[PDB]
TrEMBL record, chain A:
Compartments (UniProt record): Nucleus; Chromosome
Function noted in UniProt: Component of the FACT complex, a general chromatin factor that acts to reorganize nucleosomes. The FACT complex is involved in multiple processes that require DNA as a template such as mRNA elongation, DNA replication and DNA repair. During transcription elongation the FACT complex acts as a histone chaperone that both destabilizes and restores nucleosomal structure.
Shown stretch of the complete protein: 670 to 717 of 1005
Protein name, entry field: FACT complex subunit
Family: Belongs to the peptidase M24 family. SPT16 subfamily.
Subunit-level organization: Component of the FACT complex.
Amino acid sequence: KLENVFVRPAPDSKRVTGTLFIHQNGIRYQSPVRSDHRVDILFSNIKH
Amino acid sequence: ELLIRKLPFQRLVREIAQDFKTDLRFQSAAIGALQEASEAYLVGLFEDTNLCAIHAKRVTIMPKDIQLARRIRGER
Amino acid sequence: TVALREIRRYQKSTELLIRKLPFQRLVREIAQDFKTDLRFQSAAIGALQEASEAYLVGLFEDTNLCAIHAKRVTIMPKDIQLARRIRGER
Amino acid sequence: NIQGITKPAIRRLARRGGVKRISGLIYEETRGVLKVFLENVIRDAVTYTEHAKRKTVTAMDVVYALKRQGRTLYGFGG
Amino acid sequence: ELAGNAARDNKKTRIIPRHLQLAIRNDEELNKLLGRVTIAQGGVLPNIQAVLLPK
Amino acid sequence: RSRKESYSIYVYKVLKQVHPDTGISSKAMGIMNSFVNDIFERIAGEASRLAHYNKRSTITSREIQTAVRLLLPGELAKHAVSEGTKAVTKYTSAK
DNA sequence: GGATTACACCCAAGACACCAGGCACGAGACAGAAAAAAACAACGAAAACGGCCACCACCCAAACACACCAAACACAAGAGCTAATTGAC
DNA sequence: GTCTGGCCATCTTTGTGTTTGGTGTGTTTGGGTGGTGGCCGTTTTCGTTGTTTTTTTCTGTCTCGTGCCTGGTGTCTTGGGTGTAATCC
């Protein structure tokens, strides 16, 4: 995990720090303020 | 190739020259040099105006951009 | 409000706004890259400081003009770069 | 020695220039610009000094170097 | 002449570089003539932009 | 010792001619001397360039007048030419 | 027994500037048929530019002269850097 | 309490002046040529005219972009509040 990270584009108008997690087939950004503002990115879909 | 028409420019130059001394003659190369300098100057000014307009997040150049450019250049 | 108080205070005075020793050390550091064992008359450093501050104040005035043109109170590095490009410096 | 130009000094110079709010990168940008200016001016001055076969940089060298750039300065013997 | 006027305006009987700078930058023709010169200890004219003034 | 020339006494005389009850600091006298030298250098360089354009070996009052016209703005140039012509005629009329 | 009271100090809020998204109305680009005059060529006339030859006043050069201009530093004092605040509002 | 002023109790070396004297400008005359003036040539600049056709123009139409309005952030500072704290009957 990588803590205290901002994401662009922001999933909500409010800029909030989150934690980035490495999983088996991708990465997950997860905001501490709301569980529903998760951003999942698969390794297969990353180009660069 | 020059963009302003040659004869209208000649008439403009003569009209402006008519204030400083009456009935002056001009060499053709003088008018050609004047047109080259004028067009180069205006192209540089439009470059600066485009830079300012892009700075303002726009794409349209407006007279206040020209005014800002001439102010920064130090033009009166 | 203190910003405007300072603006009024500093457009009134004429005294040099950089400390003398830091500027002298900077000048000697820069000069040491062209020729070792160089000496500077104090008036040379004073003239350099006057010219540098006058230059920087004019540049900050142009930067302020650019910032107001963009409709901002805050001057930004892109404003400086634009002013220096329009002057014909970069 | 470029750190000697502190943030308050740049703030003071901007306030005399009429600037009301200042970003955080303005300080580094200004340090770079000042370094370039001083580099050019001191290079010209040292050229003048070497030509005059001196080891000391006089006020005349600085004044002629500023006249060379077009930054004519009054009050230093010009 | 203009520098003496500027120095009297400040109620001083001696001309300093500040009054020379004010006289130069305040006269249109002189300021156009001395457009590139910097005066040591001359300062700047008081000038606050319209949009920066408080509300 | 080092007997180096300046314009300080002349500037002071002119000041007392225009403003009797006003003095001048030394730093401003230095600035005025630098100003006089600068303007002299500009005018002489323009006069030299004009003379070389016109293939003449002499700097006369015509070159000085036209350099003044080239350098100074309208009203300022007009007043300066008036002054110069006045002085030249007054000097030439006498001897 | 139990209430009236003394005391640090934290949280709600106001005033200041900004990035980003949205919405809307108009001003500008694009196209088309029309009026315009630039451009091309021709010939005509002559003001004035480039050259030449003469002739003199003008400026450079000596040489001797004296008075205006330089720095030292005597003598008198400008008004800054300092702190409080007359005067309208 | 805001703000530009007219002044103060103390710092600092400056600013106007007299002075000694020497050098640099001023008078005098002589020479040589640069620069005016005149006279002639002939190129070149203005001037007009006819015919062609590219460019300008007037206008319409639609859409994209400029400008206004909004939520939410960070940031400095002012204010009301309360619980910690506690002693007196």
